[PDB]
Design a protein around this nucleic acid. Sequence first.
DNA 1: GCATGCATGCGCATGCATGCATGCATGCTGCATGCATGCATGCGCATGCATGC
Length: 252
Amino acid sequence: EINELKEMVKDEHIYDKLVRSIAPAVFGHEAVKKGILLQMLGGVHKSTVEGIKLRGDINICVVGDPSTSKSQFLKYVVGFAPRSVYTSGKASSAAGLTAAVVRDEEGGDYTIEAGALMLADNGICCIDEFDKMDISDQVAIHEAMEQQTISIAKAGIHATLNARTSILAAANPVGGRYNRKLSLRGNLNMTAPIMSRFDLFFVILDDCNEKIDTELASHIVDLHMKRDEAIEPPFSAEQLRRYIKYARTFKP
DNA sequence: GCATGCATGCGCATGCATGCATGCATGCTGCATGCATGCATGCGCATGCATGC
């Protein structure tokens, strides 16, 4: 088992192979593939003398219209990563994201029930259709992004809970399509505090080129004809999990 | 006229209908617990209208 890990560490094209092993079913879009890997790996958490906490999670937003293949990236991550959750904008309530309190039949105590953000602690939370979120939900997401805590005050229960999680979010342009003549802020529907703390914004735009269309169509038809014998990725999922686990234990 | 035995009251001893308090235990009952139930509340979200531009 260590034989394969030490073989991986040596190869001096390992970065390109790792990039080419992510979301193999999707065609192209290498920038998003790099971003997702960097988000699965992580940064460093630091603390100053004055108790100021320096954050070390990377947050990504993918912007495209309903035509673009932006949900396949999210479905790949929710199938690969160890602790990940998939939620959608209008099928989710605030209590289902932060937490809820229920009482025991045994009597004498209460119990907390975890939400999407708590079930993704030290992990990636996937949100599809970020633009259909309410301001009430966005104030909780902002609290999870600046602080790593969730505050509960309902029915006389006070509790501070840990949400150390990264955000993967997909957003639709405000008017269906992306206006190249406006700025990024003009095309999105987010609160200023939320937009500021996102690290990378990836915009997927369509181009009309014949050779790319031929390649894409060939790929799509190949998958239907040949089932799963149409990928031949450099690495497998079980191989990739082990490398990610090993990589997260280094402190540069 | 004298001697005798019976019936009449004294002079002991014992039992007996009334009557009332006390300590123990019975028997109920008012109190504290637990719980089902259904109406109201305090709340965040989605729609339709009014006011500009």
